[PDB]
Specification:
Layout lengths: L2 E6 L5 H14 L3 E8 L8 H13 L3 E6 L3 H11 L4 E5 L14 H7 L5 E5 L3
Parallel strand pairs: 1-2, 1-4, 2-3, 4-5
Helix pairs in contact: 3-4
The structure holds the ligand Nc1ncnc2c1ncn2[C@@H]1O[C@@H]2COP(=O)(O)O[C@H]3[C@@H](O)[C@H](n4cnc5c(N)ncnc54)O[C@@H]3COP(=O)(O)O[C@H]2[C@H]1O.
Length: 125
């Protein structure tokens, strides 16, 4: 039942995460999905990057999905649980100035959510 999802964002780093996610799904003969959580609440004019990253993953054999949610973490966690993801592939958070609650690393919320799927963090090359 191997379902591997790559978590899409508009960061420049996400493209490398897509390619590594492709290698992991291939080397594991897994079903390959790309999930972007659209949240209105910033990163001015990254809608083109997302668009690009989603197409890249489509061109690598992934089914792409867009989910609208209040939060990145809620969207991803609910979506992974409903689609029976077995591993979610995400990029490395790098700390910046904003140390408020919704600028915490995505992984802190998934951990607090007691994620039931594996999570693979891909660092920057
Ligand atoms: N559009 C953007 N432009 C510039 N910088 C951005 C950005 N979106 C996020 N970043 C920041 O840089 C890090 C890049 O994480 P990456 O996208 O490679 O890997 C991301 C991504 O795989 C996933 N993810 C992040 N946002 C997502 C979203 N809206 N929907 C689905 N997956 C998301 O979480 C991983 C770690 O996210 P985290 O927020 O903790 O860390 C993110 C964030 O601190």
């Amino acid at each position: 039942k191997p379902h591997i999802a790559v978590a899409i964002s508009g960061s420049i780093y996400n493209e490398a995460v897509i390619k590594e996610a492709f290698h992991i799904a291939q080397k594991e003969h897994a079903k390959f999905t790309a999930i972007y959580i659209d949240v209105f609440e910033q990163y001015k004019d990254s809608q083109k990057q997302v668009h690009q990253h989603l197409m890249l993953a489509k061109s690598l054999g992934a089914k792409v999905k867009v989910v609208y949610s209040q939060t990145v973490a809620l969207g991803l966690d609910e979506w992974c649980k409903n689609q029976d993801v077995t591993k979610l592939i995400i990029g490395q958070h790098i700390r910046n100035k904003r140390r408020d609650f919704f600028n915490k690393p995505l992984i802190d919320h998934l951990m607090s959510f007691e994620h039931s799927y594996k999570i693979e963090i891909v660092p920057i090359k």
